[PDB]
Design a protein around this nucleic acid. Structure first.
Lengths: 133, 236, 137, 254, 153
RNA sequence: CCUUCUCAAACAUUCUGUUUGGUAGUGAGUGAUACUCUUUGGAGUUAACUUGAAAUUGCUGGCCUUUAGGCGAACAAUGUUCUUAAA
């Protein structure tokens, strides 16, 4: 037998948990709602999980939604087995850049590049074809 | 009611649109005001003028205090207003659509025009239009309010409302006085709306407006201006 | 009795159409009959039996203008400019107010004229003209 | 400047590396890398800088692509009005004078209605290599081209100007296409400290001509940006020093 | 059905009135001395005549077919679902012949077939085809497969 | 069920020329050569290939402000509230 936890695939662009909650509440009060999320930049993976208070209400929402044409493409929702539980999702934001200070003073990496350039000359004798510089 | 799963997508994307364009406008106007033009689209602003495909002529903005009359046009198809535009409109009292007001145009007033551009229309009015507007439309705050300000206005020195026309056109002495005195303004809807003959006119002015109003969403959008003499000839 | 119907032959799907009709020429070239109708209209306009639509609109624009072109005492009893008589007006104002409406409008025609500066703004005139129109009708 | 003998040496000996018996096409193509301090504009820069280059590898690209499976194809993107006035033959007669060709012209309307479909849009762009768009339209492209168009160098558009006066003249487009085609090469401007610049397969140009192009590009970039160093290679081969400015590292810290 | 009709409303056929306006326009264009001669592309529109609709089947050319349910001679249409099933045309049973008439400049049509579609709608067409395959062929094939009715009223 | 910044200046007259500035992405996967720095946490970049706007859980960067917003704007900043597209 099934549970009240629900999986929906193929979610529109711009269609976030705030939109999901406001409809699937209309079928009835829901215990939980989440959408699967990317880390570097705030764009959709187009699928999410729901969870209803009552399994029977969860059945009805799945039934009227399993092939829901919407925004120029179809949505597919499926009820989880009784042995299913929500795990490891979080509303990721857009991860902005950082600029951290350079720790070694000037004259140390001054040496490293001369090492690296001279070193990066040495792999070329090792790769390697006759080079002077 | 079960609202829908579709209109939500339209309004969400249209809000992302309005938010990105108003953000771009904020960047550009902040950098211009602070005079930090290193990497931007343009250094000075422009004014567009549509007249009678129809000829569209553009000019550079003049830092001159110019009389204008704002007319609020129905917002885009599926948008809920962002709070910035809401505050600007509430300050200008452009809620309750089909609502206009006279405005002074200076450089400080100017950047907000891009803020509210996709919700209004600008143009250069003539005294005949202004006179028709006031002598045929215009009401003042209810009961003793209307009377008492007329006393304060008299302290400023105005009488015989035709002189309000004269000062609004002249801007010599005190516009904000008369501007606050004409706080509410209202216009009819050009088409009665629902009905067999009327719906044709709704569709026709929808097409005509779609031809006229232009949504740059550039932040260097030239100020769209229309011949208000024709717009009010329709609406008054 | 009744039993469900078996779908034993529908489940087999043919990969080809039934008939190998050769495709006709006319499906790939612009249609000839519309061209013949066009050329019928052409000969008609060449003879002048049909006017061009642009010229027709020109004729309508001229003809609208042409068609629309050719064709073949109580005021002194009433005060209205700093005069005295209306000093009866405020005295029995409650009295005229107490009459019926059809008395009131004529009875509230008369009101004190202060000076040129102020005109109250014609609250009554539109109603009086509407009533006069009904009286005609 | 940069010692040209060193670059000649590098190009000959990369020819040697390649002579040792899609990836097989790939292991012959010339990629400059440039390390430089804070190459960001603090911000994403999809705009392509057009560097002046002595030789035009697009014509060798024609001559080899005729044999290659993928055919070289040119996309121009113009306004509705420009496409209304501009005709294909007016462009073709101008381009046969120097012997090049535009393959198609497309509108923004066309992009947003005909190719508002990720598979069709992706196939349409991937067919092509040179993507030209009016500098006016260029500012509006990104939501239309799709990010996959901007990932690759060929798919991302090149800025080109049709107007010279208030209105545009066919002479301006005619000679600007020449300027972009046979006297300019693209340069993406990503973030970080690392830049990459494309030259092409070794088989197309003279290695000495390769060297002249490399040195002209490198000195232009040095005059442009403070370069930590210039690391040229083939995208299969290991890495090769030619030139480096060491004080740029000090300025990077400070 | 709503998006099916939104798709179709871009592919309304030309009315007799619009046809005659373009005809007189082009005939006037031929009128001038100094006439103009040009070649134009193919038109695009739905197709709707019953024997013509079956004709575009057995080719095949119908990328979509809509079949109205209410036809007083239902035997005119009973074969069409099975025909397109076996042929693999993506048929759909629309409800109401009158609305088909509205989108085709007719009183009623009872059928609405479409074959040729512009590139600007081709992806929409394919995705709608997959959608109708998901909503109709999958859902109701097992209940297409039983006797209906039989309950007294 | 919405539609995408569709141009700015300066110099110059060559019947149009030269220079400068203006572009935040569709998600997922494959993947070469590697580049710098970070101080090991890895971070930003790099060839180019696939895809019916495809679909299953990759755990919580940092700074600043207010009670969500900027880092592509610091006294910078944002919320979902337009009704003759009704009933």
């Amino acid at each position: 037998e099934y549970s009240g936890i629900i999986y929906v695939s193929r979610l529109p662009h711009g269609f976030h948990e705030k939109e999901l909650s406001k409809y699937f509440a209309q079928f009835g009060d829901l215990k939980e709602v989440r959408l699967a999320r990317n880390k570097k930049t705030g764009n959709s993976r187009h699928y999410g999980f729901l969870e209803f208070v009552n399994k029977e209400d969860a059945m009805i929402a799945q039934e009227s939604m399993n092939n829901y044409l919407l925004m120029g493409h179809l949505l597919q929702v499926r009820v989880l087995p009784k042995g299913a539980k929500i795990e490891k999702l979080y509303k990721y934001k857009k991860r902005v850049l950082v600029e951290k200070g350079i720790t070694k003073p000037v004259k140390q990496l001054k040496d490293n590049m001369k090492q690296k350039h001279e070193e990066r000359i040495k792999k070329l004798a090792k790769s390697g074809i006759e080079f002077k510089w | 009611k079960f609202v829908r799963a579709e209109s939500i997508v339209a309004k969400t994307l249209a809000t992302s649109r309005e938010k990105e364009r108003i953000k771009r406008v904020s960047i550009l106007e902040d950098k211009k005001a602070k005079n930090e033009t290193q990497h931007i689209a343009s250094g000075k602003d422009f004014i567009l003028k549509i007249t009678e495909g129809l000829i569209r002529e553009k000019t550079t903005y003049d830092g001159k205090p110019a009389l204008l009359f704002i007319v609020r046009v129905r917002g885009p198809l599926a948008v809920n207003i962002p709070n910035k535009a809401f505050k600007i409109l509430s300050l200008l009292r452009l809620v309750e659509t089909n609502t206009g007001v006279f405005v002074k145009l200076t450089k400080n007033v100017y950047p907000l025009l891009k803020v509210i551009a996709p919700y209004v229309v600008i143009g250069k009015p003539s005294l005949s239009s202004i006179r028709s507007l006031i002598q045929k439309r215009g009401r003042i705050i209810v009961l003793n309010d209307n009377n008492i300000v007329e006393e304060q206005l008299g302290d400023h020195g105005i009488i015989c409302v035709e002189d309000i026309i004269h000062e609004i056109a002249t801007m010599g002495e005190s516009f904000s006085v008369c501007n606050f005195f004409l706080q509410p303004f209202k216009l009819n809807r050009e088409v009665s709306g629902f009905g067999s003959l009327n719906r044709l006119r709704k569709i026709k002015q929808r097409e005509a407006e779609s031809r006229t109003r232009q949504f740059s969403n550039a932040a260097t959008a030239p100020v769209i201006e229309v011949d208000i003499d024709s717009l009010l000839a329709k609406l008054n | 009795p009744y039993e469900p119907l078996i779908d034993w032959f529908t489940r087999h799907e043919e990969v080809m159409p039934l008939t190998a009709v050769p495709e006709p020429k006319r499906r790939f070239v612009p249609s000839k009959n519309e061209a013949k109708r066009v050329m019928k209209i052409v000969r008609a306009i060449r003879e002048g039996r049909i006017i061009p639509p642009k010229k027709l609109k020109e004729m309508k624009e001229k003809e609208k203008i042409e068609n629309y072109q050719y064709d073949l005492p109580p005021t002194n009893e009433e005060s209205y400019n700093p005069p005295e008589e209306y000093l009866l007006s405020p005295e029995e104002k409650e009295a005229w107010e107490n009459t019926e409406y059809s008395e009131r409008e004529r009875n509230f025609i008369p009101q004190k004229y202060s000076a040129l500066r102020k005109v109250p703004g014609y609250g009554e005139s539109i109603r009086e003209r509407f009533e006069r129109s009904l009286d005609l009708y | 400047a940069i010692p040209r003998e060193r670059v000649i040496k590098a190009v000959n000996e990369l020819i040697k590396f390649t002579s040792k018996p899609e990836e097989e096409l790939k292991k012959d193509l010339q990629l400059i890398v440039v390390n430089n301090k804070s190459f960001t504009g603090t911000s994403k820069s999809f705009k392509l800088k057009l560097l002046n280059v002595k030789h035009s590898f697009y014509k060798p690209w024609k001559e080899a692509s005729a044999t290659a499976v993928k055919d070289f194809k040119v996309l121009l993107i113009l306004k509705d009005s420009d496409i209304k006035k501009v005709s294909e033959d007016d462009l073709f007669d101008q381009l046969d004078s120097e012997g090049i060709k535009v393959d198609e012209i497309i509108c923004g309307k066309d992009l947003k209605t005909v190719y508002k479909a990720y598979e069709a849009r992706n196939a349409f762009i991937s067919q092509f290599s040179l993507i030209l768009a009016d500098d006016s339209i260029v500012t509006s492209l990104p939501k239309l081209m799709g990010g996959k168009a901007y990932n690759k160098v060929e798919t991302t558009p090149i800025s080109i100007r049709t107007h010279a006066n208030k209105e545009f003249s066919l002479t301006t487009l005619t000679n600007n296409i020449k300027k972009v085609y046979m006297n300019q090469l693209p340069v993406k401007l990503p973030r970080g400290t690392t830049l990459n610049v494309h030259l092409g397969n070794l088989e197309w140009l003279r290695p000495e001509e390769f060297v002249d192009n490399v040195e002209l590009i490198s000195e232009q970039l040095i005059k442009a940006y403070q370069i930590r160093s210039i690391f040229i290679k083939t995208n299969r081969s290991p890495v090769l020093p030619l030139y480096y400015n060491q004080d740029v590292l000090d300025e990077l810290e400070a | 059905a709503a998006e099916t009709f939104k798709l179709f409303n871009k592919y309304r056929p030309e009315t007799a009135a619009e046809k005659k306006e373009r005809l007189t326009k082009e005939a006037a264009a031929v009128a001038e001395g100094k006439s103009k001669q040009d070649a134009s592309p193919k038109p695009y529109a739905v197709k709707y005549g019953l024997n013509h609709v079956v004709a575009l089947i057995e080719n095949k050319k119908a990328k979509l077919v809509l079949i109205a349910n209410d036809v007083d001679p239902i035997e005119l249409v009973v074969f069409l679902p099975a025909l397109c099933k076996k042929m693999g045309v993506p048929y759909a049973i629309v409800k109401g012949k009158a609305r088909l008439g509205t989108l085709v400049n007719q009183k009623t049509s009872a059928v609405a077939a479409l074959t040729e579609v512009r590139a600007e709608d081709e992806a929409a067409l394919a995705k709608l085809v997959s959608t109708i395959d998901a909503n109709f062929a999958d859902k109701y094939d097992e209940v297409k497969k039983h006797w209906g009715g039989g309950i007294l009223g």
